[PDB]
Amino acid sequence: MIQGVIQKIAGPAVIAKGMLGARMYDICKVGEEGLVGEIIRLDGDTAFVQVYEDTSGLKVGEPVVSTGLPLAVELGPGMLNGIYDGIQRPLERIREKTGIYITRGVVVHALDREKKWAWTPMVKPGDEVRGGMVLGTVPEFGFTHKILVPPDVRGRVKEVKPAGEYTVEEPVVVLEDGTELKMYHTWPVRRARPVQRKLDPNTPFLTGMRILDVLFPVAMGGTAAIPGPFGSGKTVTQQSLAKWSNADVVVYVGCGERGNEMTDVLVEFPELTDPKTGGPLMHRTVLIANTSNMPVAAREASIYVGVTIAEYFRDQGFSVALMADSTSRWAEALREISSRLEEMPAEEGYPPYLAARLAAFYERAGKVITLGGEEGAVTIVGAVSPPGGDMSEPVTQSTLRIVGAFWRLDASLAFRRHFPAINWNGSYSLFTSALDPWYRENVAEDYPELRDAISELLQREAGLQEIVQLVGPDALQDAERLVIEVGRIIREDFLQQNAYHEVDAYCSMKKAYGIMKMILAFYKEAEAAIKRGVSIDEILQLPVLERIGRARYVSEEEFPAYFEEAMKEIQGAFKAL
Amino acid sequence: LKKEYTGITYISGPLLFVENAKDLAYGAIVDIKDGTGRVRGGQVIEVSEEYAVIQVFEETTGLDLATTSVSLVEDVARLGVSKEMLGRRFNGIGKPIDGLPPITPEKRLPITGLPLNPVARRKPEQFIQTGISTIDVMNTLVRGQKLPIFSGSGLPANEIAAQIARQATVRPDLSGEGEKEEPFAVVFAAMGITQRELSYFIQEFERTGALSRSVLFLNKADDPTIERILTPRMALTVAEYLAFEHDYHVLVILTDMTNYCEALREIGAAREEIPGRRGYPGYMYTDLATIYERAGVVEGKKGSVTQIPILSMPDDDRTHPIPDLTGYITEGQIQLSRELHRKGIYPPIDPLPSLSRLMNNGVGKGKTREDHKQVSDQLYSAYANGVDIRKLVAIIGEDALTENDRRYLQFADAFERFFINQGQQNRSIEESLQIAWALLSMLPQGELKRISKDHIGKYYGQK
Amino acid sequence: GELLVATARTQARGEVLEEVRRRVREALEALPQKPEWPEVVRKLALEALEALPGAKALVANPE
Ligand SMILES: Nc1ncnc2c1ncn2[C@@H]1O[C@H](COP(=O)(O)OP(=O)(O)O)[C@@H](O)[C@H]1O
Ligand SMILES: [Mg+2]
C-alpha cells in the first residue's frame, strides 16, 4: 500500500508523488481505471511510472496504487493454443468481453478459472519435495503437462488430492508447512528461472529450410539472430521456422510487428498438422503478440513474458523454440521512455543499458538439465531490423557479439525473387564443429567433408566474381566457367526454396544430403571430362541438369528412388562424352 | 565496524544517490543491502559534500528508499593475490567459481597499475614458441611484446586462443644454455564471453593438463559490465605480480577487446559525459594504453610478460577505432581471414597482412636458428607473388605461363595447405623450419634470391 | 596426477582454516560466559560512539 497521487502526466509517463516506500519495477494501478504501470527512476517521494496502456484523459490528482510485486506471469496449464498481449491477458476473452477494439482498463486472468483439468498425482503423502520436482500430471492436447513445485518451495507433503476433475486453483498438494500448491504459480519476468546445470549443445535445430540446416546450422540450445532490411523475408522465414521445426512447443513473440501477419498465424495454422505427432499445429504454439499501434511500453513486457514462458516449458522437460521478431522495436521502446526520463543517450539515441539487457535476454537460452532432473532446451531466434538497412547499428552490432548463427538477409537477392534471401558472404554459424558427430551419426558418414566441399565451391565462386565483373565471362577459361556454372546451379537449385509449393517447404537432411551429392558428382565428373577435352557449352545443355534442377521439387517419400535414378544417369551422361 | 549510510534518495537505472557521505573515497567498492538481504556491489563515482553517487553493478529491482543501505568495502579496489592461484577460475571481481576454497592472500594489490619507468625497461630480445607455424616462422612472438589477433566475426578466434594457451612454451634449449627451470604461466582474461564459449574453455583447459599452470578470469555476458571493465586490470596485475616478483615468464591472453571497448562506451555514457569519435569516449586511447603498456621485459628482472589480445574488428575494417588504436599502440598484428577459413584451413592466418614489428630483434643466431629471418622473408615474397599468379591464371589459362610462374603457383597452393593448414598438432620450431625448406624446395636454387649462400647449400633439397 | 595431488592438498588446507573459523565463532558466541564480557561490551560501545561525530542514539540488548 503505497497509495499516492499523480503529479505529472506526459505521454506514456506518469510521475506520481506521495509514494515513499514503493520499490523499483513494481506493478502500479494508475488512475481510476487501474491502468497497469511499472515504477522506474524513483526519487524524493515521487516515482516515475510508465504505463502499459495509453494515458489520454487521465487527470492530475488521480490515485496511483502500488502493488508491491514485479511484473509476474502466471504459469501453468492452459497456455498452449493461446494468444496473449504484452502483459499476458488473452485477447479472445477481451473480444468476448469488449468489442473488436482493445479498450483500456480491462482485467481478465491469464488462465481459465473454470476449465477442469484431469489431475493425476505422482506423490504419496509424506514425500520430500524440493524445488522443481513434479507433483503430478495433466493431459493437455496430447501433451503431458507436468505440474511442478515452484522453484523456491521446499518441504514435506501433508496431503495430496485424489485424481479426477479439478479447476486450476484448487489446492492439489498441501505441504506440512501450511503452504498450498495450486496448478499454477507466478514468476517475476526479469529474473531467470533457476536451473541445475548448463550442458553443451550436440543436437541441431532442424529448421526445414535447406540453407539454414545445412550451411549454417544451429544447435538445440543455441541463440541465433537474423537481421534484414524491410521487405527482405524475415517474417516469412520465421513463420516457416515456427511451422516446420522439430521443437516440441513454439512461442512466437510478435514484439512490435503488424497485425495481418499475426492473423495469418491465427487463421492458417489450425488447418495444418504438427510434424512430430498428430495434433494440429496451433496446439503447440503459444503466441504473444503486442502489435505496432497497441501501446508502446508493453514491448519490453512482451519479450520478457515470451522468454519466461519458454523457460517454464523448458523446466517441464520440453524443447521450446522462441521466435521473437523485431527486438529493435523493443530497443525503440527503450529509446522513447529514456526520452521521457531525460537520461542521457548513448550513440544513436538508445539508452546505455541496451546491450546489458540484450545479453540478459539472449543468455537465457541453452539446453539445460532442469531442476526436475530431466533435460530440456530453449532455443532463441531473434529477428533484428536495422533502421537504415545497415548492420552498423547498436542493435545489430550488439546482437552479433552475443550470438552464434547469424543469418543475414539481403535485398538484392530479395529484389530479384530469390528466396530465402540469405547473404552467403556475411552469414556464419559457430555450431558446426559441435554438430559434426551428430551428422556423422544420424545423417550420413561422409556428411561434413561433403558440406565443406560445397562451402569451398561457393568460396571459389565468390573469389572469381571479382574477375568476372572486371572483365566479363569473356576470357575465363574452361575450368573457371565451370566453377561459375556449378556455383550458379547450387544457388538456383539447392539453396533457393519457395515456401508455397506443397512439397519443398520442408526438406529433411536426407534430401539435402542427396542434392549436395548430386551436384558434387556432376561437378567432379564434369571437370574430369573437361580435362579430357570437350566444350563446356554442351556440358551445360545435358538432359541431367534439369533433373538435378527439379530434384528439390520431388517428394520426401519418393525421393530415394529419384536419387538412385539420377545418380545412375549422372554417371551415365558423361561417358557418352 | 561497518557504517551504513542509509538515507538514500534517487535511484535511477544504474545510479543511486546517498545523502550524507563525506567518507567514501572516489572509486570505492560498496555493498548495497536490499530490503530483504541480498547484497549487491557498487562503485562510488562522484563523491561530493552534499551527496555521493553509487553506480550499482547488477540490476536494481528490490530497491526502495526506506530499507536500502550502502556500506563501504575496500575503499580502493584491491585484489588479494598469491602464488597459489595457478589452478583457479575467477569472475571479474576475483572470487573463485570452481568450488575450491578461497586463496590465502599473501599480498593485496591495487588493480589499477602503476606505469613502468622507461629507464628501467630493457628491450625485448628472445622468442616464445607458440607451436603455430605461420606465427613461429613468419612473425615470431618475442617475450616482452604485445601483438593482437585481428579476428573477424565468424572466425574461430577463441579456438586459436585456447590453442596458444595450452601450447605455448618458452624453450631454453636453443638459447645460450640458460637453466631449463624457467617457469611459465598463462593468464587468460576472457571478458564478455557467452556461456557456450565458457564451457568450451573450461573443458578445453581441463582435458589436456594445462590448467595446472594457467589462471582464468572468465566473465559471461550477463555479468555486470563494470566487472568486465575491471577484468583486464585483474589479469594484468596477477601477471605483473607473478612475472616481476617470482621470475615467471607470463603470457597474457586478453580475449575480446571489442567487448571491453563496448563495456567502456556504455559505462562512459553512464558517467554522464560526452563521447568522442564515432561515439566511443574521448579517453579511449589512454584507457587502452593503460592495459597494453603493462607488458615487457625489465632490466634486472628475470621475468617477462607477453601479451596477445584477441579482438574482433566490428565490420571488417582496420579504420575502426578499436583496431585503429590497438594497432597504434601494439606491435604488429596477425590477422585471420574468412577466405582461408571458408576453404577450410585451421588456423586461418593469412601471412600477407600480418606483421610483427619486433621479430627482427628476436630471431636469428643463437636465439632460435641462423636462417630464420631469411627463410621468413623468402616465404613471404614467394607466397606473395604466388597469389597474384593464381589470380592471373583465371584469365590467362595455365598453358600461357612460363615454367617459373607455374612453379610459383604450385608453391602457393601447397603452402597454404601444408604450412598453414596445421590442424591441431604442435609444430615445434624446427619442424616448422623443415616444412619451410621442404616448401621452398619446390623452387629452383637461385630463384631463392633473398637467402644467402650457405643456407641454400645446407638445407635445400628436401621432400 | 600432480594436479590431483595439489588439489587434494588445497582442499585439505581449506578445512583447517574453516575449523579455525568455527573455533573463533563459538568462542565469541560463548563469550558472554566470561567476567570481562562487561568490559568488552562497554569498550566497543565506547568505540562506536567514539568514531562517529554527532552520535545520538545507541542500540544494544537489554542484557
Ligand atoms: N521461403 C520463401 N518462400 C516464398 N516466398 C518468400 C520466402 N521468403 C520470403 N518470401 C517473400 O518475401 C516477402 C517478404 O516478406 P516478409 O518476411 O514479411 O518481409 P520482412 O523481411 O519485411 O519481414 C514476402 O512477401 C514473401 O512473399
Ligand atoms: Mg517484419
Side-chain angles (χ1 to χ4, degrees):
Chain A
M1 192 277 292
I2 316 296
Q3 191 271 338
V5 295
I6 292 179
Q7 175 171 357
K8 184 185 289 185
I9 303 167
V14 171
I15 292 173
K17 70 188 177 184
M19 295 180 72
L20 178 60
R23 298 175 301 176
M24 291 286 285
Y25 299 95
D26 290 338
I27 301 299
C28 287
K29 276 82 67 181
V30 180
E32 295 177 352
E33 298 188 356
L35 279 76
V36 179
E38 197 169 7
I39 284 179
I40 54 173
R41 207 279 298 269
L42 73 97
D43 54 349
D45 53 354
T46 66
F48 194 95
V49 172
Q50 68 181 1
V51 289
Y52 298 103
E53 295 179 353
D54 49 348
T55 61
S56 71
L58 271 73
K59 295 167 71 173
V60 291
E62 289 187 354
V64 170
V65 178
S66 173
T67 309
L69 288 86
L71 180 66
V73 293
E74 293 180 349
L75 298 170
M79 289 190 295
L80 296 174
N81 195 1
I83 172 167
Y84 292 110
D85 58 353
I87 57 172
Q88 195 191 7
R89 300 174 298 173
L91 298 176
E92 69 275 19
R93 297 297 182 186
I94 295 169
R95 185 180 179 272
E96 294 177 357
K97 183 172 287 292
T98 323
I100 63 169
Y101 288 91
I102 294 170
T103 303
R104 65 178 180 176
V106 56
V107 48
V108 293
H109 299 103
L111 280 72
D112 290 335
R113 296 299 192 274
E114 69 176 0
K115 183 181 182 293
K116 294 183 69 66
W117 300 100
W119 167 264
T120 161
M122 288 183 181
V123 288
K124 296 183 265 75
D127 295 336
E128 195 276 336
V129 287
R130 63 193 186 276
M133 185 175 174
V134 289
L135 293 179
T137 287
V138 168
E140 183 192 8
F141 300 112
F143 295 96
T144 296
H145 199 268
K146 291 181 258 76
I147 294 173
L148 298 170
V149 179
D152 292 330
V153 166
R154 181 177 291 273
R156 289 185 61 246
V157 172
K158 187 173 183 179
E159 73 171 2
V160 171
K161 298 294 187 288
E165 299 293 326
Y166 286 92
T167 79
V168 180
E169 290 183 352
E170 301 192 4
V172 297
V173 170
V174 181
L175 303 185
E176 291 184 354
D177 204 2
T179 301
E180 293 185 353
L181 309 175
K182 299 176 181 68
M183 290 186 179
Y184 72 101
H185 57 274
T186 60
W187 187 256
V189 300
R190 295 185 174 89
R191 290 188 60 246
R193 288 185 61 97
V195 72
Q196 187 179 3
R197 196 185 189 275
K198 302 297 285 287
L199 289 164
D200 48 359
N202 53 7
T203 294
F205 180 62
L206 292 188
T207 300
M209 306 176 73
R210 282 193 292 273
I211 175 164
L212 299 178
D213 66 357
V214 173
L215 265 299
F216 311 115
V218 50
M220 206 73 205
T223 73
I226 174 170
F230 68 99
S232 299
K234 300 184 266 78
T235 307
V236 180
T237 294
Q238 283 181 345
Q239 286 181 357
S240 181
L241 262 74
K243 197 184 292 180
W244 295 112
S245 65
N246 58 357
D248 285 331
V249 307
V250 168
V251 175
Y252 189 82
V253 178
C255 179
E257 286 291 331
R258 62 179 67 85
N260 286 314
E261 292 177 350
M262 200 72 70
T263 313
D264 291 329
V265 186
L266 290 170
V267 176
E268 73 183 0
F269 276 11
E271 66 177 4
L272 301 178
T273 297
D274 194 359
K276 291 176 93 286
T277 58
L281 187 53
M282 197 58 202
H283 295 177
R284 69 106 175 270
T285 61
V286 178
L287 196 149
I288 283 93
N290 186 7
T291 65
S292 301
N293 51 1
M294 292 174 64
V296 79
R299 294 174 182 175
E300 184 180 0
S302 295
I303 284 294
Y304 285 115
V305 166
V307 69
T308 191
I309 289 174
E311 292 181 358
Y312 174 60
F313 292 104
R314 184 191 71 193
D315 284 333
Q316 284 181 356
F318 287 151
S319 174
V320 189
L322 182 142
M323 288 78 169
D325 53 5
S326 299
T327 69
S328 55
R329 302 289 175 254
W330 166 50
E332 182 185 1
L334 296 176
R335 180 168 65 185
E336 302 182 2
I337 208 65
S338 73
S339 167
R340 298 291 183 182
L341 282 175
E342 62 180 1
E343 294 289 326
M344 184 173 287
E347 185 178 358
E348 193 66 31
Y350 297 106
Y353 49 88
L354 181 65
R357 290 186 177 181
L358 283 170
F361 165 69
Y362 279 109
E363 294 294 327
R364 292 181 69 185
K367 184 73 176 301
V368 310
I369 291 173
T370 56
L371 285 168
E374 58 185 0
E375 74 176 1
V378 174
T379 171
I380 289 173
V381 174
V384 165
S385 64
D390 52 347
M391 290 74 167
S392 297
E393 292 288 323
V395 181
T396 300
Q397 289 186 355
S398 175
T399 197
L400 68 89
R401 296 194 307 267
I402 62 172
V403 306
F406 177 80
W407 298 327
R408 181 173 180 174
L409 292 163
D410 63 345
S412 298
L413 297 171
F415 282 168
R416 63 183 66 200
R417 298 294 183 267
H418 177 271
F419 297 113
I422 298 295
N423 192 3
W424 180 71
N425 200 6
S427 300
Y428 67 97
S429 175
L430 298 177
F431 300 97
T432 67
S433 68
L435 289 176
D436 187 3
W438 193 79
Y439 286 155
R440 290 183 185 270
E441 186 68 26
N442 295 117
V443 187
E445 177 68 29
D446 49 350
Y447 181 81
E449 299 88 0
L450 186 73
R451 180 186 66 198
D452 299 337
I454 286 292
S455 288
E456 68 185 3
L457 261 63
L458 288 177
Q459 170 57 44
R460 290 178 65 186
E461 181 187 5
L464 268 293
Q465 282 297 107
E466 176 182 5
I467 311 300
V468 77
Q469 77 174 357
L470 197 138
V471 169
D474 190 77
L476 289 178
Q477 301 300 317
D478 286 329
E480 314 302 316
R481 189 178 292 160
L482 180 61
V483 169
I484 292 298
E485 295 294 323
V486 174
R488 183 184 57 84
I489 200 168
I490 294 168
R491 289 184 287 112
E492 288 187 357
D493 292 325
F494 176 70
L495 303 173
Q496 186 186 5
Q497 182 180 3
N498 57 351
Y500 297 115
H501 191 284
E502 293 179 353
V503 186
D504 188 74
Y506 180 69
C507 187
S508 64
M509 288 197 294
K510 294 294 185 180
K511 186 173 175 182
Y513 176 74
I515 301 168
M516 290 185 294
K517 197 174 177 182
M518 284 183 277
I519 298 171
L520 260 293
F522 167 71
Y523 173 73
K524 182 179 71 66
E525 298 175 357
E527 75 180 3
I530 208 167
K531 63 96 182 178
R532 190 172 65 191
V534 295
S535 177
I536 179 172
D537 302 333
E538 69 178 359
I539 300 172
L540 300 170
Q541 293 175 355
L542 291 165
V544 72
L545 268 71
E546 190 177 4
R547 295 182 67 254
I548 295 171
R550 300 286 184 177
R552 62 187 180 92
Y553 286 158
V554 301
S555 175
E556 292 169 349
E557 297 173 352
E558 66 185 8
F559 197 78
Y562 187 79
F563 180 67
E564 293 177 357
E565 179 68 31
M567 289 300 290
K568 264 59 177 296
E569 193 169 2
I570 198 59
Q571 189 182 4
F574 287 157
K575 187 58 66 66
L577 268 291
Chain B
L1 195 141
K2 53 180 71 172
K3 186 183 292 181
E4 304 184 1
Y5 298 105
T6 172
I8 54 106
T9 174
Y10 187 76
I11 292 102
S12 168
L15 298 174
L16 69 90
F17 296 171
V18 179
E19 282 189 355
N20 199 5
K22 291 167 69 176
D23 304 336
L24 311 179
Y26 172 75
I29 310 299
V30 292
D31 302 335
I32 299 170
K33 285 178 282 291
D34 297 333
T36 67
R38 183 181 181 177
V39 175
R40 293 183 182 90
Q43 185 176 3
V44 173
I45 64 169
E46 193 168 358
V47 59
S48 63
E49 73 179 1
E50 68 265 14
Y51 52 79
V53 181
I54 289 172
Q55 187 179 4
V56 187
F57 291 175
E58 308 182 359
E59 72 277 15
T60 57
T61 298
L63 299 176
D64 51 354
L65 301 178
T67 64
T68 299
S69 65
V70 305
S71 302
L72 193 149
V73 47
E74 191 180 3
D75 61 347
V76 67
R78 294 181 184 88
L79 180 62
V81 71
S82 167
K83 181 259 181 66
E84 194 275 335
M85 50 191 292
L86 291 175
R88 311 299 302 276
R89 299 178 284 164
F90 294 100
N91 50 357
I93 302 298
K95 297 184 289 290
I97 50 174
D98 50 356
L100 300 185
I103 55 173
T104 65
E106 73 183 5
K107 291 183 71 174
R108 294 190 64 85
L109 292 172
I111 66 167
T112 179
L114 298 172
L116 279 170
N117 196 348
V119 171
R121 181 184 297 188
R122 67 174 182 176
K123 70 190 291 184
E125 66 176 1
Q126 295 196 2
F127 87 112
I128 169 167
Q129 71 171 359
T130 58
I132 292 172
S133 181
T134 178
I135 292 169
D136 298 338
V137 183
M138 298 179 74
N139 37 8
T140 304
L141 183 66
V142 304
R143 287 196 294 271
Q145 188 190 359
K146 70 284 285 181
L147 70 85
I149 297 183
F150 285 168
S151 166
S153 68
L155 303 173
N158 293 325
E159 303 186 359
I160 183 170
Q163 174 159 351
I164 302 168
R166 65 174 172 82
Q167 183 164 344
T169 176
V170 302
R171 204 180 63 192
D173 294 332
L174 260 296
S175 69
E177 177 64 39
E179 177 61 27
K180 274 80 63 180
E181 171 62 31
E182 284 185 354
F184 189 77
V186 181
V187 182
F188 190 86
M191 61 196 83
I193 61 174
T194 327
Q195 174 62 42
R196 173 189 67 251
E197 315 182 4
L198 189 141
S199 66
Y200 177 73
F201 284 123
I202 62 98
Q203 183 172 0
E204 188 82 26
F205 271 96
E206 295 292 330
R207 61 100 176 269
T208 295
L211 189 270
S212 66
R213 62 182 174 91
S214 71
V215 52
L216 314 178
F217 285 103
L218 304 168
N219 58 346
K220 305 184 266 79
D222 52 351
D223 276 336
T225 68
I226 175 168
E227 299 180 354
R228 186 187 299 166
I229 299 300
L230 297 181
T231 290
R233 268 75 171 178
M234 296 290 176
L236 287 164
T237 190
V238 166
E240 190 177 0
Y241 163 72
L242 286 170
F244 296 114
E245 297 182 1
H246 297 285
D247 302 332
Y248 286 0
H249 296 282
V250 173
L251 170 58
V252 185
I253 292 171
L254 305 181
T255 300
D256 295 328
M257 293 297 291
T258 302
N259 281 317
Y260 179 69
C261 297
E262 299 291 329
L264 179 58
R265 181 173 69 182
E266 295 176 354
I267 286 170
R271 294 285 189 272
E272 188 258 333
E273 66 183 1
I274 286 177
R277 185 176 182 270
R278 290 181 194 252
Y280 297 111
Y283 60 97
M284 183 179 173
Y285 176 79
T286 303
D287 205 4
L288 292 174
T290 305
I291 71 166
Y292 294 160
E293 295 284 318
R294 293 177 66 184
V297 294
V298 162
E299 182 173 0
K301 293 292 187 180
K302 297 185 74 69
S304 67
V305 187
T306 312
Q307 189 172 3
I308 291 175
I310 295 168
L311 57 92
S312 293
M313 298 182 289
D315 209 75
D316 299 330
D317 49 350
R318 195 175 288 166
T319 58
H320 191 79
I322 297 163
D324 195 2
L325 303 172
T326 296
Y328 189 64
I329 302 168
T330 57
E331 292 170 351
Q333 70 272 9
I334 61 173
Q335 186 171 7
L336 307 187
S337 72
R338 283 178 186 84
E339 182 175 2
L340 280 78
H341 169 68
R342 286 170 179 170
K343 292 178 182 293
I345 284 171
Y346 181 71
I349 292 171
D350 53 341
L352 297 175
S354 297
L355 181 59
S356 178
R357 299 173 66 93
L358 200 62
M359 177 181 69
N360 295 313
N361 303 116
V363 297
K365 180 68 175 67
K367 300 181 182 70
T368 165
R369 206 180 76 183
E370 184 179 1
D371 55 347
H372 189 280
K373 186 173 72 176
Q374 293 172 355
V375 166
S376 173
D377 289 330
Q378 182 57 47
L379 282 169
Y380 179 75
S381 73
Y383 174 70
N385 61 1
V387 168
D388 54 359
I389 289 175
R390 176 184 295 166
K391 195 189 292 182
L392 180 65
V393 84
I395 53 172
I396 289 294
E398 200 273 336
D399 56 356
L401 289 168
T402 70
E403 180 65 28
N404 199 0
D405 296 335
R406 181 179 295 116
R407 298 183 65 83
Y408 277 103
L409 192 149
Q410 290 181 352
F411 174 75
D413 205 3
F415 176 78
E416 71 184 6
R417 64 175 181 84
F418 289 100
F419 189 80
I420 300 175
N421 187 352
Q422 181 175 358
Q424 288 181 354
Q425 62 173 355
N426 193 358
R427 287 177 179 171
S428 64
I429 187 64
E430 296 91 2
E431 298 182 357
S432 297
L433 293 172
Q434 72 181 353
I435 289 170
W437 282 108
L439 263 295
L440 284 180
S441 298
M442 292 188 291
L443 305 183
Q445 300 191 6
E447 184 68 30
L448 277 59
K449 294 183 182 293
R450 298 181 185 272
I451 309 166
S452 176
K453 184 59 70 176
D454 297 333
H455 306 109
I456 299 173
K458 283 177 91 286
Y459 297 97
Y460 188 81
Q462 180 51 253
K463 193 182 85 174
Chain C
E2 287 169 354
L3 180 57
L4 194 273
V5 173
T7 190
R9 184 258 186 89
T10 181
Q11 189 181 3
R13 296 177 75 188
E15 64 201 3
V16 181
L17 294 167
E18 195 275 334
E19 65 190 359
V20 168
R21 192 186 176 100
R22 185 181 176 177
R23 296 300 185 276
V24 65
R25 185 177 299 276
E26 63 178 358
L28 58 86
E29 190 175 359
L31 209 148
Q33 299 167 355
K34 186 184 75 174
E36 288 88 5
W37 166 263
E39 177 56 36
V40 70
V41 166
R42 182 177 180 178
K43 176 65 176 64
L44 54 88
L46 198 152
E47 189 174 5
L49 297 176
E50 174 183 0
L52 173 62
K56 189 178 191 294
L58 197 149
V59 165
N61 296 312
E63 177 180 359

